[PDB]
């Protein structure tokens, strides 16, 4: 019933520390050695780390060594991984995962997103993009995500919600599109609804 | 370190469709071969380990084959389920432990041309001494475009961001944005603001424009 769930991940600043965890659930934890991968945005698998059984050996990738200790508590059935002198590139969806019973990564857990930024908390403005095609620029916003609807949720049909780019600023940018009957338009209502919840940031934007 | 190969970058196949994977090993890797699926928005999933083993509650349509440096995945016919990632990595020599790059498996479909939207900047942001122009791509096939901007006849490099949508569930299409990145000065300055737009399926290429 084997179970394993991440926890701590967060915006970070350059420089600073962060600490990981992994619960296990459904196995043997004690029994097995553990690794973390991971996992930057647009971007393959990278490993990371790895300890044993027994907490005796622990193996480190070339990229991370000496800022990341990789650790365990046995017998709360814990994994952890501290970050220290982070820099932006350490920015990675991170795995935890079991070894069997060897190199072979069995189980994974679902991740735990970590985002290293010298870049302040931000709400976007939202701006109009007036068959026929609208939409909405969220423009200059951190960090991620943020949400997209039209019309409440009502309008799905001819959406595009497209990723976020990252600014040079460090905030980021994005659009939601819409194509529609030129007919409607006169006519058909819409607005685009904007929810940016690490700021507490709520938009509603008519566009037309 | 091993360094993990994996061709081709890109599968474009059709449902029902037989589904085969590869994956190059720089030195003898032996037996020690391992295959996963990710699927987007989630984590990995092992399907074969050590070539030619199936992970449990791995269904049979998916299958190994190989030995030293070269490597084949399997699968028999394509669910849709099944367009996806996939992820080859070895045990024989580590650390490190490593991935190959990803082998990403595309709908195939007849190719389509892009729908083509250009955005001038909004009066609002006008002010905050913002400028973004945007160009829209709309529902196309294949994934390559390109786009160029120009302002007053004078291309754009550096100034520029762009993205991609996933495939479209229904459609099989990809959509993109791209955005021009502008002084509120620059801006004013300027005329002729247009984007270019070229693609497979375009006869040539073609070119949204606006007059500030």
């Known amino acids: 019933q084997v179970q394993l769930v991440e926890s701590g991940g967060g915006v970070v600043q350059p420089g600073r520390s962060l600490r990981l965890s992994c619960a296990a659930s459904?196995?043997?934890?004690?029994?097995?050695?553990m690794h973390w991968v991971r996992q930057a945005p647009g971007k393959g698998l990278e490993w990371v780390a790895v300890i044993s059984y027994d907490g005796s050996n622990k193996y480190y990738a070339d990229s991370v060594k000496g800022r990341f200790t990789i650790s365990r508590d046995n017998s709360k059935n814990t994994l952890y991984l501290q970050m220290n002198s982070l820099r932006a590139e350490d920015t990675a969806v991170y795995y935890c995962?079991?070894?069997?019973?060897?190199?072979?990564?069995?189980?994974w857990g679902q991740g735990t997103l970590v985002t290293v930024s010298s870049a302040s908390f931000k709400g976007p403005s939202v701006f109009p993009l007036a068959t026929a095609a609208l939409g909405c620029l969220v423009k200059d916003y951190f960090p991620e995500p943020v949400t997209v609807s039209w019309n409440s949720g009502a309008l799905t049909s001819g959406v595009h919600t497209f990723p976020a780019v990252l600014q040079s600023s460090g905030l980021y940018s994005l659009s939601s599109v819409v194509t529609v009957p030129s007919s409607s338009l006169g006519t058909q209502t819409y607005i685009c609804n904007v929810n940016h919840k690490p700021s507490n940031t709520k938009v509603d934007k008519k566009v037309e | 370190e091993i360094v993990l190969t994996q061709s081709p970058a890109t599968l474009s196949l059709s449902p029902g469709e037989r589904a085969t994977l590869s994956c190059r090993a720089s030195q003898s890797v032996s037996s020690y071969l391992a295959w996963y699926q990710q699927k987007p928005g989630q984590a990995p999933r092992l399907l074969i380990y050590?070539?030619?083993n199936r992970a449990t509650g791995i269904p049979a349509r998916f299958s190994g084959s190989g030995s030293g440096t070269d490597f084949t995945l399997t699968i028999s016919s394509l669910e849709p389920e099944d367009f996806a990632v996939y992820y080859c990595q070895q045990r024989s020599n580590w650390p490190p432990i490593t991935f190959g790059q990803g082998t990403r498996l595309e709908i195939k479909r007849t190719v389509a041309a892009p729908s083509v939207f250009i955005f001038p900047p909004s009066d609002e942001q006008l002010k905050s001494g913002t400028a973004s122009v945007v160009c829209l791509l709309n529902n196309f096939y294949p994934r390559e475009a390109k786009v160029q901007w120009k302002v007053d006849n004078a291309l754009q490099s550096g100034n520029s961001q762009e993205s991609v949508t996933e495939q479209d569930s229904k459609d099989s299409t990809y959509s993109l944005s791209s955005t021009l990145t502008l002084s509120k000065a620059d801006y004013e300055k300027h005329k002729v603001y247009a984007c270019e737009v070229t693609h497979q399926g375009l006869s040539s290429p073609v070119t949204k424009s606006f007059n500030r």
């Open positions: 995962a079991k070894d069997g019973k060897s190199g072979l990564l069995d189980y």
């Open positions: 050590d070539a030619s």
């Open positions: 459904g196995f043997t934890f004690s029994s097995y050695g």
